[PDB]
Each structure stands twice: as structure tokens, then as C-alpha cells.
Amino acid sequence: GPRFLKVKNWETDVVLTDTLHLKSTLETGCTEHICMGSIMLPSQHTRKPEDVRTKDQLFPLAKEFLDQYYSSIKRFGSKAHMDRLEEVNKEIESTSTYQLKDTELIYGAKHAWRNASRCVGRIQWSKLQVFDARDCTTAHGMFNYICNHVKYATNKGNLRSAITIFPQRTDGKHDFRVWNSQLIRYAGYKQPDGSTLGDPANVQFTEICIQQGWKAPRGRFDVLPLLLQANGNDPELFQIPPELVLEVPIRHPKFDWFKDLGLKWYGLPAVSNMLLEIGGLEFSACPFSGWYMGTEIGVRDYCDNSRYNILEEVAKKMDLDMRKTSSLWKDQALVEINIAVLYSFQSDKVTIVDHHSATESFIKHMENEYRCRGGCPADWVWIVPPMSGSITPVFHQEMLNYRLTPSFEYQPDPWNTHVW
Amino acid sequence: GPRFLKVKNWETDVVLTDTLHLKSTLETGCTEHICMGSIMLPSQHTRKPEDVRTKDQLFPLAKEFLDQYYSSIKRFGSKAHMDRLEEVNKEIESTSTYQLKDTELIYGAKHAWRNASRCVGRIQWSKLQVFDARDCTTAHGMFNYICNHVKYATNKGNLRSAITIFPQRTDGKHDFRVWNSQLIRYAGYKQPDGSTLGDPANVQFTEICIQQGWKAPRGRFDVLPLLLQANGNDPELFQIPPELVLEVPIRHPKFDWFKDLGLKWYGLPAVSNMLLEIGGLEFSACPFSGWYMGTEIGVRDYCDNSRYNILEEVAKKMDLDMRKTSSLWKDQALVEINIAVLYSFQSDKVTIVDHHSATESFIKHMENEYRCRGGCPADWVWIVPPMSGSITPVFHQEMLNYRLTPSFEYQPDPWNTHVW
């Protein structure tokens, strides 16, 4: 195209013209002579530990969002729009910052998710519960908001989307950081015999909680303590009330022996280490959650090598021909494990989506976004399920990726930064 | 990095610094504000039907390759290098073109494959048989070279890499085009009852051969006739000697009923519709072949929706719960089908590689290319197998993609262009 890029679905032949990319301003990390589409943290905006943005750098960014917001409600250049702008301009000049109206905070949150190029479940983008935790001032208060979130979202297995937003970053006042990767996760212990008990991806965090006092049960599926950081103060340990952490015992609809593998997982996926940016405002603590896509647990959490890595054992138990890789025994154990997850979650009536339905609705969503927003940023490398990618429609779907604001961003783990 | 990009393997944590990308000059299609890493034909150089490159545009490109070639043999700026350059400069001035020495043609061919960012089997790059078909002048002569290629490469099931290079493009003299996508492929017929018999992806080509006289057996696995175009003359039909087309009957090492599905495939993957560019020279007819990676046939050729699409039938026969998608019945049928392919090919002793071993050696190859060539262009979207992607090491492998020359490129199907 000359300026209206096209994306084609190669299985269906459908074509979509993108005009939305012209609103992008952040960099992708790619050039004209190089593509970094498969790089995890291309760092085009992977946050910096350095000082906070300034007054000059702040208003343009704040204005951009507000011009965007009022345009959304077809009120661009209104008396209201204009006064709001002077309002924030005036408020930034004095305080070096500014506070978003409650409506603006919801728009910004919903849209950060609508713009998350790596999320395949964005069709749910408009249905999000926003918990304004901006008045919070302590870790205990943070703990409380988090508990309410957990309970609200789990909703006795009938999961609901939600995000809790703590105080924005200021400068000296300080940062609020949920030191945990996800609200709910299992511990990992480096055994003296080389082996690792529990999720290996958490061995480094688990060591923090312990050197902070945690009474580690030292088992396989030990839900880790919350370690909250409020107003730039040292984090504090908190135990999520067990009765609030919904879990699901993994069993197979045919292999009764599967049960004996002792596999269990939590039903609430709550990302809590990213950053929400709206109008140039940084919300370093914005735990968000939705519900699982089966492969997340079955393929990655369980079968990833550096994670639980249950391929052999599951394979052995199946009595599979592990003599050579051409027996596709890994692929076989992998399909069964994933059938056990969906089956289990669905048996206990906990919300879950399989890769087939998930990716099917994303195409539907893409079609909505191109038919109403002029496009949709999608990261093909992330949107395509980690198993049977080709038999899911998104594989054959060309996808344009670009960075839109407001958005969710990665940020430095605080234990690297924080002193004391 | 500041100029030395880094790629990390997220499962192994290994890191590789790339310096090779600085040699790139062709565009990727990506910008600073947009990524097109998941676009099939980003058209940065998807050929053009327009006139051929000119004398001025030709020498720089020719020089680049020669400077590259002599640098390879540590002879940069030699008397030889310099005289060769004047040689070609002189030869281009008179003829508007130039002919590559036989050594240069092999270097260029091997490296087009070494630079093919989308090919996962490049570890085999240095072991390639080059058949110089530049003296060819007819379709019959083209047919002959092709037959020798087939026979050579099949090597009674002990497949060998090879590429046959026909006369370069000139201007008026004309184009040589193997009108076939791949040397060996099956026909596809649009049934009156809506249905499609045989590979649907070939229904449009099959119609050409028929309106050219082909006596279509009108079955499911009808190897199509060769339709060769020589010196810009109308293509001509040729039947590959049946005794040269090695095929493999698909059966399963446990499901005797699988046999009854009547699945068969050819063992020689021979791409014949691309373009080889060396020193600015265009080789519009350069059929190349290696050997199969199981998923190519099992996942794509067979299960792709718009292809053979054998999911249901295979699933039904398995007596799988197709009530809902969460039964992962597609995933189940998909794993079995692929076990049948490897098993079959390996039984008849025909060369084949599974995704596990294939992707394992690519990592090994990447490590070689970074440890000796300063890098390796890889397209993550293509290099990752269409099934069980996450349990194969390349999924966790960050990959930098850039365009190096010499290379293989896509080109317009000639029936759209060619008159008469």
C-alpha cells in the first residue's frame, strides 16, 4: 500500500487495511534493515530507573491522551476539553504532576489492554473492573486492596476481569511496587542435590521472601507470600488468605493414574509486575487479571524446560517410546497434559479458555478493530499458541505490530534498584 | 547494545552478539514505528515484472558480490580481484550483462541458502550440489536437466541437496521459468458438487496443464506435469518419468486402519518458483531441493484447512470426542498423523527429519554462524514448527532477521505476466 497497510489471512484470504498504525509514535525496535519482532524486551520503552519525566516532557504527553480521550467521546476541542487541558496544564506547573479524573482512568486502563499487542484475549477489553487504589499509602492498605481484587476476580470460579491501580509515580514521594511477578504464584527451592523443588522461575524471588522471614512450607505448590512496596518503603510480607486462593487439582478424563502426578495450579492469572502509562502518568503498581488460556499452564508453566518440566515423567507413565525423538512422545505427552488442564478446570467449574476458541475470538476481535478503530496492533510471535499453532487461525493471520498509548510496559525488578 | 545487537535464548540464557546485520542493505519492510515480521510478502524485493536492471544499476551490485567473494577467500584487493572487477565492468559495458565464473556461481548458490532467513535446515548449507544449466536453450533441455536433478537428489531415498541453475535473465533474450511451484506436486480439481479433489492449493495450476493438453487421471494424488518455459517462449508440458518420482504410502505404527485413509506423499521437496540473485544477476529458474521436515507434510500439507484438510476424517476414525474443541481432538489427530509420516518415511528408508532434531540443529547452526560469521538472519515466524512450537528450542530463541545477498526471492507467477 501507499500508506494504508494491508494484512491478509492466508487461510481465508480475507484482507484488512490498517490506518491505525499512523497514530503510533513509540518505536518498535525494528529498522528498515532489521527486524526485532522476536526479541522479548526490545527496550524501546522498557522503562528506566532514572529520574521521573519532567514538567516539560509531561504536558505534551498529558495533552496527547486528553485530545485522544475527548476525541473518543466526540468532544474534541470542546469548552470542556480545552478547560480540562488548561486545568492539567495549570496543575502540572505547580505540582510537577497531575491526577486523572475517574473517567479518564478507566478509559486509559481499558485502552492499555485494548492496545496490548501481545494479549490474545483483548476481545474482552471493554469489560474490565477498575479498582482505584490511588488513596492507598501503606503495604497493609495495598494488601487489603489486593485481597479484595483476588476475591472479586475469582468470583467463586466464575472469573471476572479487573485491575487495581495504586498511586502514580511522582519523584521523591516514591514508588508503589507489588514485588511479585503475579499476585498468585508458587515458590521454587534450589535443592542441594542440584534438583529444584517447585516452579524454578521463582527460585530468586522465593529467596527474598525467606530472607524477609517467610515460613516456607518447602513443598512443590507453595503459594508465595505477597511482598508489597508502598511509597518507596521497604517491602513487607503478607500471606494471601488461603480461602481466597482458588486452586484446581489436575486430573485426566481417562488416565486415572494422571491424578497421581500430583499436579495442581491456581485459577487466577494476575500479572502484577508491569507498568500502566496514561497521559504520561506512570502506575508502577497495577496488578491486573483475567482468566487462563489452557496452553499457558499446560504447555508453558508445566512443560517449559526451565519451569516445571513434566515431559519425561508424564511420558514415562504413559509408557511412551522415548527411544528416539521421532516417536513424537513429547508431543504426545503434551497433548494429554493439556487435555487434563481444560478438563480439570471445567470440572471444578473454574473459567478457562482453550487455544482454539481463544484465537478464534481474536480474529473476530481483529475484524472488529479494523472495522471500527482502523486496525489493531498484534504481536504474531506472542498471539500464536505454544502448541498446534498451525491448526489455530491466528497462525495464518498476518499481524501488524506497533506501539499505542496508553499501554502496559515492563519495568526493572525493584530488588535490583531499591536500597535497604 | 550500541551497534552490536544481542539475541538471548530464554530457556538456556545463552547470548549471541550480532555484527552481521551491519552488512544488510535491502529493507525488511519494518520501520521504527511498525513491524511487519509476520507479513508473508513484505515486498521489499518481491521482484518486479518491469524492465531488467540496467548497466549502471548492475556494476555496483556485481562489484559488491565480487568484493564479498574475494573477501571470503582472503584475497580482497588482489590483482585477481581487481582484474576480475575490470573484467566484469568491461563485459557489462558491452553486453549490458555478464557471466559468473563457475566458482562464483557455487559460492553464490551456497550463500543464497546460507542467507535464507526462513529456512531452518541451513546447517546443511555448505553441502549443496550445483547443476549449471546455463547452456540450456529449450524446454526439452530444461526437462532433461530437471530429470537428472530429480534422480540425483532422490538418490534412491538417500536424498541429497542440489539446485539446478538455468540461464540468467537478460532483457529481450528472455526468461526461463519452471511454471511449477515445486518440481513434484499433486493436482487439484474443483468438483461440481463444491468439493475439491486433491491438493486445493494447485487447482489453478492444474487448470493450466489441462488447457494445455494434460491428460489428468483426475484422482487424489496425481503428480502434475512439468510445464517449462524456456527463453521466454510459451511453456510446454512434460511428464516426469514415474520411475523417478519416489513416493511414500502413509501408515501408522499402531493404527492399522490408518492405511485405509489412503494417504501418500512424495519424498522430494523441490522449490522451483523462486529467484536466485547473485552479483545483481537474476536466475528466474533455479529449482532447489533438500529433504522434508515431518511437520511440512503432516501439519501443513495435510491438516491446513485450504489444503488436504484431513482433521475430521482422521479424528472420526479415531472415534474422538468432537463434541467440543476443548477435547483437543484436532491436536490429537494432528499428533498421530505426524507420527505416521515420520514412521512411514523412515520405514521405506526415505530421508526425513522431525521438528525436534531439525530445530535442535538450527540452534547449533546459529551458534556456528555467530561464532564464525558474526551472526545469522533468522525469521522466527517461519523457523518455529507449526506444531508443539514451545517444546522445540527455537521458540525460546530470539532471532534477528535482515536481508543478505546473494539470496532467494519470490517472483510473479508467469501466467499473470506471459502473453500467448
Ligand code: HEM
Ligand atoms: C480475559 C482473559 C484474558 C486472556 C485469556 C488473555 C490471554 C493472554 C495470554 C495467553 C497471554 C500470554 C502470557 C504469557 O505468555 O506470559 C497474555 C498476555 C498479555 N495480556 Fe492478556 N489476556 C486476558 C486478560 C488480560 C487483562 C485483564 C489484561 C489487562 C487489562 C491483559 C494484558 C495482557 C498483557 C499486557 C500481556 C503481555 C504480557 C507480557 O508482555 O509479558 N490480559 N494474555
Ligand code: HEM
Ligand atoms: C536439507 C533440507 C532442508 C530442510 C529440512 C529445510 C527446511 C525448510 C522448511 C521446513 C521450510 C518451510 C517451507 C514452507 O513452509 O513452505 C524451508 C524454507 C526454505 N528453505 Fe529450506 N530446508 C532445506 C533445504 C533447502 C535448500 C536445498 C535450499 C536452497 C539451496 C533451501 C531454501 C529455503 C528457502 C528459500 C525457504 C523459504 C521458502 C519461502 O520463503 O517460501 N532449503 N526450509
Ligand SMILES: C[C@H](O)[C@H](O)[C@H]1CNc2nc(N)[nH]c(=O)c2N1
Ligand atoms: C500470516 C503468517 O505470516 C503465515 O501464516 C506464516 C507463519 N509462519 C510460517 N512458517 C513456515 N515455516 N511456513 C509458512 O508457510 C508460514 N506461514
Ligand SMILES: C[C@H](O)[C@H](O)[C@H]1CNc2nc(N)[nH]c(=O)c2N1
Ligand atoms: C524468543 C521468543 O521471543 C520468546 O521465546 C517468545 C515467543 N513467543 C511467546 N509467546 C507468548 N505468548 N509468550 C511467551 O512467553 C513467548 N516467548
Ligand SMILES: CC(=N)NCc1cccc(CN)c1
Ligand atoms: C492474563 C493472562 N491470561 N495471562 C497473562 C500472564 C499471566 C501470568 C504471567 C504472565 C507473564 N507474562 C502473564
Ligand SMILES: CC(=N)NCc1cccc(CN)c1
Ligand atoms: C526444502 C524444504 N524442506 N521445503 C521448502 C518447500 C517445499 C515445498 C514448498 C515450499 C513453499 N514454500 C517450500
Ligand SMILES: [Zn+2]
Ligand atoms: Zn520488525
